[PDB]
Amino acid sequence: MVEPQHNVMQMGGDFANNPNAQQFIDKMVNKHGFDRQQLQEILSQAKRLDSVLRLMDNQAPGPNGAWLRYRKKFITPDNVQNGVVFWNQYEDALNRAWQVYGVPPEIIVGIIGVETRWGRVMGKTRILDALATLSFNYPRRAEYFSGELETFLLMARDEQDDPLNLKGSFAGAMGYGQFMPSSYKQYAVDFSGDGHINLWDPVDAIGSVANYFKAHGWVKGDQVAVMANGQAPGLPNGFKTKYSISQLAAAGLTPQQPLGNHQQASLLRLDVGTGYQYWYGLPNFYTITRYNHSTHYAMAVWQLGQAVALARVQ
Numbered sequence: 001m002v003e004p005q006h007n008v009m010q011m012g013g014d015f016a017n018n019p020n021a022q023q024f025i026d027k028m029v030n031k032h033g034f035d036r037q038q039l040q041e042i043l044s045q046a047k048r049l050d051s052v053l054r055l056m057d058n059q060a061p062g063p064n065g066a067w068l069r070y071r072k073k074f075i076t077p078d079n080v081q082n083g084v085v086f087w088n089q090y091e092d093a094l095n096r097a098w099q100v101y102g103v104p105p106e107i108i109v110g111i112i113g114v115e116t117r118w119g120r121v122m123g124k125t126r127i128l129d130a131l132a133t134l135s136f137n138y139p140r141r142a143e144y145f146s147g148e149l150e151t152f153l154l155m156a157r158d159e160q161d162d163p164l165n166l167k168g169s170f171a172g173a174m175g176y177g178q179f180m181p182s183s184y185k186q187y188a189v190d191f192s193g194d195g196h197i198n199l200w201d202p203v204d205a206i207g208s209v210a211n212y213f214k215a216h217g218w219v220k221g222d223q224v225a226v227m228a229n230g231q232a233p234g235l236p237n238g239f240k241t242k243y244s245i246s247q248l249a250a251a252g253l254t255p256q257q258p259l260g261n262h263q264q265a266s267l268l269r270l271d272v273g274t275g276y277q278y279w280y281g282l283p284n285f286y287t288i289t290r291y292n293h294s295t296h297y298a299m300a301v302w303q304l305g306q307a308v309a310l311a312r313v314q
Protein backbone atom coordinates (compact mmCIF):
# COMPACT_ATOMS: atom_id res chain seq x y z
CA MET A 1 0.00 0.00 0.00
CA VAL A 2 1.93 3.00 1.33
CA GLU A 3 5.61 3.20 0.33
CA PRO A 4 7.36 5.91 2.42
CA GLN A 5 10.86 4.99 1.19
CA HIS A 6 12.68 6.80 4.01
CA ASN A 7 15.88 4.96 2.99
CA VAL A 8 15.78 6.39 -0.56
CA MET A 9 17.73 9.54 0.33
CA GLN A 10 19.53 10.03 -2.98
CA MET A 11 17.80 11.26 -6.13
CA GLY A 12 19.13 10.86 -9.65
CA GLY A 13 19.13 13.28 -12.56
CA ASP A 14 21.06 16.43 -13.43
CA PHE A 15 20.83 17.79 -9.87
CA ALA A 16 21.65 14.52 -8.05
CA ASN A 17 24.85 15.67 -6.32
CA ASN A 18 23.97 19.37 -6.18
CA PRO A 19 24.34 20.75 -2.60
CA ASN A 20 21.98 23.63 -3.40
CA ALA A 21 19.26 21.23 -4.55
CA GLN A 22 19.64 19.19 -1.35
CA GLN A 23 19.48 22.28 0.86
CA PHE A 24 16.40 23.48 -1.03
CA ILE A 25 14.62 20.15 -0.46
CA ASP A 26 15.44 20.38 3.27
CA LYS A 27 13.93 23.86 3.36
CA MET A 28 10.73 22.79 1.59
CA VAL A 29 10.32 19.90 4.03
CA ASN A 30 10.96 21.91 7.20
CA LYS A 31 9.20 25.11 6.18
CA HIS A 32 6.28 23.74 4.14
CA GLY A 33 5.86 20.13 5.18
CA PHE A 34 6.84 18.71 1.80
CA ASP A 35 7.55 14.96 1.59
CA ARG A 36 11.31 14.67 0.91
CA GLN A 37 10.87 11.59 -1.29
CA GLN A 38 8.11 13.16 -3.40
CA LEU A 39 10.33 16.21 -3.88
CA GLN A 40 13.32 14.02 -4.86
CA GLU A 41 11.10 12.26 -7.43
CA ILE A 42 10.11 15.62 -8.91
CA LEU A 43 13.62 17.11 -8.93
CA SER A 44 15.19 13.89 -10.23
CA GLN A 45 13.22 14.60 -13.43
CA ALA A 46 14.19 18.29 -13.56
CA LYS A 47 16.74 19.14 -16.24
CA ARG A 48 19.71 21.51 -15.97
CA LEU A 49 19.24 23.62 -19.11
CA ASP A 50 22.57 25.10 -20.13
CA SER A 51 20.76 27.28 -22.69
CA VAL A 52 18.92 28.95 -19.82
CA LEU A 53 22.27 29.65 -18.11
CA ARG A 54 23.80 31.05 -21.30
CA LEU A 55 20.84 33.36 -21.93
CA MET A 56 20.86 34.63 -18.34
CA ASP A 57 24.56 35.50 -18.88
CA ASN A 58 23.93 37.23 -22.24
CA GLN A 59 21.28 39.38 -20.56
CA ALA A 60 23.53 40.14 -17.58
CA PRO A 61 24.06 43.88 -16.84
CA GLY A 62 24.08 55.41 -33.23
CA PRO A 63 21.70 56.60 -34.44
CA ASN A 64 21.37 53.18 -36.10
CA GLY A 65 17.60 52.63 -35.82
CA ALA A 66 17.55 50.54 -32.62
CA TRP A 67 14.05 51.63 -31.56
CA LEU A 68 12.63 51.04 -35.06
CA ARG A 69 13.94 47.47 -35.12
CA TYR A 70 12.45 46.70 -31.71
CA ARG A 71 9.19 48.45 -32.59
CA LYS A 72 8.61 46.57 -35.85
CA LYS A 73 8.76 43.24 -34.01
CA PHE A 74 5.47 44.19 -32.31
CA ILE A 75 3.76 46.92 -34.34
CA THR A 76 2.81 45.38 -37.68
CA PRO A 77 -0.55 44.99 -39.47
CA ASP A 78 -0.79 41.31 -38.43
CA ASN A 79 -0.10 42.08 -34.77
CA VAL A 80 -2.39 45.11 -34.53
CA GLN A 81 -5.19 43.15 -36.23
CA ASN A 82 -4.77 40.23 -33.80
CA GLY A 83 -4.81 42.75 -30.97
CA VAL A 84 -8.11 44.18 -32.21
CA VAL A 85 -9.58 40.67 -32.28
CA PHE A 86 -8.38 39.99 -28.72
CA TRP A 87 -9.79 43.28 -27.42
CA ASN A 88 -13.20 42.65 -29.00
CA GLN A 89 -13.28 39.05 -27.81
CA TYR A 90 -12.61 40.08 -24.19
CA GLU A 91 -14.05 43.60 -24.23
CA ASP A 92 -16.25 42.99 -21.20
CA ALA A 93 -13.34 41.66 -19.11
CA LEU A 94 -11.16 44.59 -20.23
CA ASN A 95 -13.84 47.17 -19.37
CA ARG A 96 -14.36 45.51 -15.98
CA ALA A 97 -10.60 45.59 -15.29
CA TRP A 98 -10.69 49.29 -16.15
CA GLN A 99 -13.57 49.90 -13.70
CA VAL A 100 -12.06 47.82 -10.88
CA TYR A 101 -8.37 48.73 -11.20
CA GLY A 102 -8.32 51.90 -13.30
CA VAL A 103 -5.94 50.36 -15.86
CA PRO A 104 -7.14 50.99 -19.46
CA PRO A 105 -7.69 48.23 -22.06
CA GLU A 106 -4.90 49.47 -24.35
CA ILE A 107 -2.34 48.90 -21.61
CA ILE A 108 -3.59 45.38 -20.81
CA VAL A 109 -3.92 44.52 -24.51
CA GLY A 110 -0.45 45.92 -25.17
CA ILE A 111 1.11 43.94 -22.30
CA ILE A 112 -0.46 40.63 -23.36
CA GLY A 113 0.43 41.34 -26.99
CA VAL A 114 4.11 42.04 -26.35
CA GLU A 115 4.34 39.14 -23.89
CA THR A 116 2.69 36.29 -25.80
CA ARG A 117 0.97 37.76 -28.88
CA TRP A 118 -2.31 37.16 -27.04
CA GLY A 119 -1.66 33.54 -26.07
CA ARG A 120 0.06 32.44 -29.30
CA VAL A 121 3.55 32.33 -27.77
CA MET A 122 3.32 31.15 -24.15
CA GLY A 123 6.74 29.48 -24.04
CA LYS A 124 7.91 25.87 -24.38
CA THR A 125 10.27 25.46 -21.43
CA ARG A 126 9.10 23.45 -18.42
CA ILE A 127 8.90 25.96 -15.54
CA LEU A 128 10.48 23.37 -13.21
CA ASP A 129 13.55 22.90 -15.42
CA ALA A 130 14.09 26.64 -15.79
CA LEU A 131 13.67 27.39 -12.09
CA ALA A 132 15.72 24.41 -10.87
CA THR A 133 18.53 25.32 -13.27
CA LEU A 134 18.58 28.97 -12.13
CA SER A 135 18.19 28.09 -8.44
CA PHE A 136 20.84 25.37 -8.30
CA ASN A 137 23.39 26.24 -11.01
CA TYR A 138 23.34 30.01 -11.25
CA PRO A 139 24.95 31.68 -8.19
CA ARG A 140 24.36 35.28 -9.37
CA ARG A 141 20.57 35.06 -9.04
CA ALA A 142 20.24 31.74 -7.18
CA GLU A 143 18.46 33.26 -4.16
CA TYR A 144 15.90 35.09 -6.28
CA PHE A 145 15.13 32.04 -8.40
CA SER A 146 15.04 29.70 -5.40
CA GLY A 147 12.29 31.91 -4.01
CA GLU A 148 10.47 31.59 -7.36
CA LEU A 149 10.92 27.78 -7.35
CA GLU A 150 9.61 27.61 -3.78
CA THR A 151 6.53 29.64 -4.75
CA PHE A 152 6.05 27.57 -7.93
CA LEU A 153 5.99 24.25 -6.04
CA LEU A 154 3.56 25.74 -3.50
CA MET A 155 1.37 26.94 -6.40
CA ALA A 156 1.43 23.52 -8.05
CA ARG A 157 0.59 21.82 -4.74
CA ASP A 158 -2.32 24.21 -4.07
CA GLU A 159 -3.95 24.21 -7.51
CA GLN A 160 -3.08 20.49 -7.72
CA ASP A 161 -1.02 20.88 -10.92
CA ASP A 162 1.71 18.44 -11.94
CA PRO A 163 4.77 20.72 -11.52
CA LEU A 164 6.33 19.00 -14.54
CA ASN A 165 3.54 19.82 -17.00
CA LEU A 166 3.58 23.64 -16.82
CA LYS A 167 5.60 25.45 -19.47
CA GLY A 168 6.72 29.00 -20.03
CA SER A 169 9.80 31.15 -20.54
CA PHE A 170 13.49 30.48 -19.92
CA ALA A 171 13.09 32.43 -16.67
CA GLY A 172 10.00 30.54 -15.49
CA ALA A 173 7.40 33.16 -16.57
CA MET A 174 3.89 31.84 -17.20
CA GLY A 175 0.71 32.32 -19.21
CA TYR A 176 -0.81 35.13 -21.24
CA GLY A 177 0.95 37.82 -19.21
CA GLN A 178 4.15 35.89 -18.47
CA PHE A 179 3.87 36.24 -14.69
CA MET A 180 6.76 35.00 -12.55
CA PRO A 181 5.67 32.69 -9.65
CA SER A 182 6.09 35.48 -7.08
CA SER A 183 3.98 37.83 -9.21
CA TYR A 184 1.27 35.14 -9.36
CA LYS A 185 1.44 34.87 -5.57
CA GLN A 186 1.27 38.61 -4.92
CA TYR A 187 -0.78 39.99 -7.82
CA ALA A 188 -2.71 37.34 -9.74
CA VAL A 189 -6.49 37.39 -9.29
CA ASP A 190 -9.35 35.04 -10.15
CA PHE A 191 -10.94 37.59 -12.49
CA SER A 192 -13.08 34.95 -14.24
CA GLY A 193 -14.68 34.04 -10.91
CA ASP A 194 -14.47 30.22 -11.04
CA GLY A 195 -12.53 30.15 -7.77
CA HIS A 196 -9.19 29.39 -9.43
CA ILE A 197 -6.32 31.64 -10.50
CA ASN A 198 -5.25 30.37 -13.92
CA LEU A 199 -2.48 32.31 -15.69
CA TRP A 200 -3.49 30.57 -18.94
CA ASP A 201 -7.12 31.80 -18.71
CA PRO A 202 -7.29 35.09 -20.72
CA VAL A 203 -9.86 36.62 -18.33
CA ASP A 204 -7.77 35.87 -15.22
CA ALA A 205 -4.69 37.20 -17.02
CA ILE A 206 -6.49 40.46 -17.88
CA GLY A 207 -7.47 41.07 -14.25
CA SER A 208 -4.05 39.97 -13.03
CA VAL A 209 -2.21 42.42 -15.31
CA ALA A 210 -4.54 45.20 -14.13
CA ASN A 211 -4.01 44.40 -10.45
CA TYR A 212 -0.25 44.23 -11.01
CA PHE A 213 -0.36 47.73 -12.53
CA LYS A 214 -2.52 49.24 -9.80
CA ALA A 215 -0.27 47.65 -7.16
CA HIS A 216 2.74 49.23 -8.85
CA GLY A 217 1.34 52.76 -8.85
CA TRP A 218 -0.71 53.17 -12.03
CA VAL A 219 -2.58 56.48 -11.95
CA LYS A 220 -5.98 56.24 -13.66
CA GLY A 221 -6.36 58.69 -16.55
CA ASP A 222 -2.80 59.98 -16.26
CA GLN A 223 -0.59 60.36 -19.33
CA VAL A 224 2.09 57.73 -19.96
CA ALA A 225 4.68 59.65 -21.99
CA VAL A 226 4.70 62.82 -24.11
CA MET A 227 6.93 63.29 -27.13
CA ALA A 228 9.15 66.34 -27.08
CA ASN A 229 10.03 68.92 -29.69
CA GLY A 230 13.73 69.71 -29.62
CA GLN A 231 16.84 67.78 -28.67
CA ALA A 232 18.71 67.31 -25.38
CA PRO A 233 21.98 65.59 -26.49
CA GLY A 234 23.97 66.33 -23.34
CA LEU A 235 21.53 64.90 -20.78
CA PRO A 236 21.74 61.24 -19.64
CA ASN A 237 18.59 59.31 -20.63
CA GLY A 238 16.59 56.19 -19.76
CA PHE A 239 13.54 55.25 -17.70
CA LYS A 240 15.50 55.71 -14.45
CA THR A 241 16.45 59.34 -15.17
CA LYS A 242 14.75 62.20 -13.41
CA TYR A 243 14.63 65.89 -14.34
CA SER A 244 12.29 68.72 -13.46
CA ILE A 245 10.22 70.05 -16.37
CA SER A 246 12.12 73.32 -15.89
CA GLN A 247 15.50 71.60 -16.40
CA LEU A 248 14.30 69.85 -19.57
CA ALA A 249 13.02 73.18 -20.91
CA ALA A 250 16.44 74.71 -20.23
CA ALA A 251 17.94 71.78 -22.16
CA GLY A 252 15.88 72.79 -25.20
CA LEU A 253 12.79 70.56 -24.98
CA THR A 254 9.09 71.45 -25.06
CA PRO A 255 6.22 68.98 -24.64
CA GLN A 256 3.99 68.27 -27.66
CA GLN A 257 1.07 67.80 -25.26
CA PRO A 258 0.23 69.58 -21.97
CA LEU A 259 1.87 67.91 -18.97
CA GLY A 260 -0.80 69.01 -16.48
CA ASN A 261 0.54 69.25 -12.92
CA HIS A 262 3.64 67.10 -13.56
CA GLN A 263 6.79 68.81 -12.37
CA GLN A 264 9.30 66.07 -13.22
CA ALA A 265 9.82 63.46 -15.89
CA SER A 266 12.39 60.96 -17.06
CA LEU A 267 14.18 61.70 -20.33
CA LEU A 268 13.63 58.93 -22.86
CA ARG A 269 15.60 58.88 -26.10
CA LEU A 270 14.59 56.58 -28.94
CA ASP A 271 16.98 55.81 -31.80
CA VAL A 272 14.94 56.29 -34.97
CA GLY A 273 17.79 55.91 -37.48
CA THR A 274 17.79 59.47 -38.84
CA GLY A 275 18.47 60.67 -35.31
CA TYR A 276 16.95 60.62 -31.84
CA GLN A 277 13.40 61.07 -30.60
CA TYR A 278 13.04 62.58 -27.13
CA TRP A 279 10.13 61.95 -24.76
CA TYR A 280 9.00 63.12 -21.32
CA GLY A 281 8.50 59.90 -19.35
CA LEU A 282 5.73 60.33 -16.79
CA PRO A 283 5.00 58.14 -13.71
CA ASN A 284 2.75 55.73 -15.66
CA PHE A 285 5.60 55.00 -18.09
CA TYR A 286 7.78 54.00 -15.13
CA THR A 287 4.94 51.79 -13.89
CA ILE A 288 5.06 49.91 -17.20
CA THR A 289 8.80 49.27 -16.69
CA ARG A 290 7.92 47.66 -13.32
CA TYR A 291 6.44 44.80 -15.38
CA ASN A 292 9.66 44.42 -17.42
CA HIS A 293 12.64 46.72 -16.74
CA SER A 294 13.16 48.17 -20.23
CA THR A 295 12.46 51.48 -21.99
CA HIS A 296 11.92 49.79 -25.36
CA TYR A 297 9.62 47.21 -23.74
CA ALA A 298 7.42 49.85 -22.09
CA MET A 299 7.29 52.05 -25.19
CA ALA A 300 6.33 49.07 -27.36
CA VAL A 301 3.59 48.03 -24.91
CA TRP A 302 2.12 51.53 -24.86
CA GLN A 303 2.38 52.20 -28.60
CA LEU A 304 1.04 48.72 -29.47
CA GLY A 305 -1.93 49.32 -27.20
CA GLN A 306 -2.56 52.72 -28.80
CA ALA A 307 -2.25 51.25 -32.30
CA VAL A 308 -4.85 48.61 -31.45
CA ALA A 309 -7.16 51.20 -29.86
CA LEU A 310 -7.11 53.33 -33.02
CA ALA A 311 -7.49 50.30 -35.31
CA ARG A 312 -10.74 49.43 -33.47
CA VAL A 313 -12.36 52.81 -34.19
CA GLN A 314 -12.19 52.06 -37.93
Ligand SMILES: CC(=O)N[C@H]1[C@H](O[C@H]2C[C@@H](C(=O)NCCS(=O)(=O)O)[NH2+][C@@H]2CO)O[C@H](CO)[C@@H](OS(=O)(=O)O)[C@@H]1O
Pocket residue numbers: 115169170171172173177178179180183212290291292293
Ligand atom coordinates in the same frame (compact mmCIF):
# COMPACT_ATOMS: atom_id res chain seq x y z
C1 LIG B 1 4.71 40.35 -14.45
C2 LIG B 1 6.03 39.92 -13.88
O1 LIG B 1 6.09 38.83 -13.30
N1 LIG B 1 7.08 40.73 -14.00
C3 LIG B 1 8.39 40.37 -13.48
C4 LIG B 1 9.37 40.24 -14.66
O2 LIG B 1 8.93 39.16 -15.47
C5 LIG B 1 9.51 39.09 -16.75
C6 LIG B 1 10.62 38.07 -16.88
C7 LIG B 1 10.67 37.96 -18.40
C8 LIG B 1 11.25 36.63 -18.91
O3 LIG B 1 10.59 35.60 -18.81
N2 LIG B 1 12.48 36.66 -19.42
C9 LIG B 1 13.18 35.48 -19.93
C10 LIG B 1 13.94 35.77 -21.21
S1 LIG B 1 12.86 35.99 -22.66
O4 LIG B 1 12.87 37.40 -23.08
O5 LIG B 1 11.48 35.61 -22.36
O6 LIG B 1 13.30 35.14 -23.76
N3 LIG B 1 9.21 38.10 -18.82
C11 LIG B 1 8.46 38.50 -17.64
C12 LIG B 1 7.35 39.47 -18.03
O7 LIG B 1 7.88 40.53 -18.81
O8 LIG B 1 10.70 40.01 -14.22
C13 LIG B 1 11.25 41.03 -13.39
C14 LIG B 1 12.76 40.71 -13.20
O9 LIG B 1 12.93 39.36 -12.76
C15 LIG B 1 10.38 41.15 -12.11
O10 LIG B 1 10.84 42.22 -11.31
S2 LIG B 1 11.44 41.88 -9.88
O11 LIG B 1 10.41 41.32 -9.02
O12 LIG B 1 11.98 43.11 -9.33
O13 LIG B 1 12.51 40.89 -10.03
C16 LIG B 1 8.90 41.42 -12.47
O14 LIG B 1 8.15 41.47 -11.27
Ligand SMILES: [Ca+2]
Pocket residue numbers: 190191192193194195196197198201204
Ligand atom coordinates in the same frame (compact mmCIF):
# COMPACT_ATOMS: atom_id res chain seq x y z
CA1 LIG C 1 -10.29 31.91 -12.83
